[PDB]
Design a protein around this ligand. Sequence first.
Ligand SMILES: [Mg+2]
Ligand SMILES: [Mg+2]
Lengths: 132, 152, 101, 140, 149
Amino acid sequence: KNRAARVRVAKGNKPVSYEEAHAPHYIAHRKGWLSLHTGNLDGEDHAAERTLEDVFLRKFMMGTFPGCLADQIVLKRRANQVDICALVLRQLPAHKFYFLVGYSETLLSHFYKCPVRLHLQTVPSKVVYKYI
Amino acid sequence: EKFEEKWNDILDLLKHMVAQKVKPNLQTFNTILKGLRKCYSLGRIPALQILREMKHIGIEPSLATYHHIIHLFYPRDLSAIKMPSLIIYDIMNELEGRTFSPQDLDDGRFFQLAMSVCSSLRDLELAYQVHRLLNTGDNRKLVGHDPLRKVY
Amino acid sequence: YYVDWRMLRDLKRRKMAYEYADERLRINSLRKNTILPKDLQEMAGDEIAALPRDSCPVRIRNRCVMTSRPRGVKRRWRLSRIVFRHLADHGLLSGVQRAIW
Amino acid sequence: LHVDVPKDVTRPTITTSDEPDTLYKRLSILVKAHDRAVLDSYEYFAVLAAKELGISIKVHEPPRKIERFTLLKSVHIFKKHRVQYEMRTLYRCLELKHLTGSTASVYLEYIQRNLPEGVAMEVTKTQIQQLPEHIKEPMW
Amino acid sequence: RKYLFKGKRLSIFADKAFADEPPEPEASPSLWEIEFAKQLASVADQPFENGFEEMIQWTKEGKLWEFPVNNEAGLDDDGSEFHEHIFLDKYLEDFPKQGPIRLFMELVTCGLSKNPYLSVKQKVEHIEWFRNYFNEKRDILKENNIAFT
Ligand SMILES: [Mg+2]
Ligand SMILES: [Mg+2]
């Protein structure tokens, strides 16, 4: 049996998001890609360096916004600009988000030497695609 | 103690600026007008003379330079509201359509002060001229900072 | 801290090969020809031998950057098959999908 | 804005030089992406932009490339059981013609600054110039 | 009546027939002039109004790439020329004019001319290394009938 990235069935009480519900074979069919860069296109270089930055950028955002992430973040690279689009729960006060945005942007712009912007869409609570 | 002595002293500094072949800049005239705002009553004739001398020399009056003339001619604590001065109308005509750049540290103050005089005079046509000047070019950048942006 | 002591030894091998690259190039050039006297070539054969062993660039092994796995690595991403599949099967690699045909 | 509108918006300064301008006979723009729909939207934006600036444009779709590789599915043994992965590359070629160097810089900036994420461009400018003055006349 | 530019003036100063005679940088910018300029910028300092104004500032600061893209922007190899990279035989004058060493150095300088990953300075360093190497091996070369320098 295949165990890869499959949220298995319980007794109908496990909420799962759209991203979690779909197994790997639905990638490019029902669900898209969380990161969009040009490094895996044919005749393009620096796939390894873009992929390592993604791993870190995801671990950074989880720790910097602990318990405030409704879904996995979406990374969008255009030219040298990096754009982070994160669904965040409305747990923290509003002013705290302004602090963490200023901090996380400046810190990641001086770490990778690129302009990095954070885009936050706040949800009242996690969106449930289906109960499995 | 005596304004006439004080004014004659400041002029003496200006006369030594010509003896030493030193040419004045915008800040020099702006500084003199900013000092004149203390003597509202007696600084009116001196203030106009400075602006005429500014153009003859070739120094271009900036938004800050008018900010001082307005303060000197339209006092906020003005008891004599019956017959206010008409200079504000002439200034706006002079500055109609012109674009201004940062050239002094009181440029932001001009726009906030101009609207205040319009509200005191209850002239909405003048308020449109002032706002219309704010929209020409990139004048929007001289509206003012947080304290003065919300007042304007 | 790197993943393990094996990745640490590999990292040092990569930094000592970069230091000795020009040197090992200039000396080894004197040997890879038939135009110079064999006496010089026999002597250059020992100058290259005398350099430290970690300067040799064939002692470098490509390891998964995240798990330090010596085999199973894909050179375009520098990840093992196990780590690559975890990122690919989760939609985190840009443009990588399963191959159905 | 209903009542409040800019009066005299400031526009950049464009100064005509005395140097002659480059003459591009052709300018091929090969965009690449994993997604066909993104290329269709970019093709519409780029063709509309060219037509609005007076540039002559043609578009075709070079054949797509699919790169497939196989991996071992299990962590240990079970050799016969594999998992396969592929990366798909799609192409849209925008062939422009008879462009001066000023028209090609403004156009390329405008379309490159609006290049979607995951899209790679490969501009192939083809300049036309006279013969070298030495070559023009044989000299012994 | 209250004409802004019609009437008597102070007249202490005279019309500037000569204008800006002393240069603006009479001395290297002093702390007084460097700090006043920073304050003038703050006078018109307003926050970004859209993505264009943000990108404009990033470009002026070098944070954002310039467009159209130039893959060699800021990449000048010491202002060299093609002839400097390709014709390198001027540096082989110290070496023997003929013989085995010349035949070898011909191959070395041919490869260096076809090397796009090295600057001229680095290519010259490769040649200089061989000059000192053969000088050290003068005695072994003399046994083989090769005379160096
Ligand atoms: Mg361990
Ligand atoms: Mg090996």
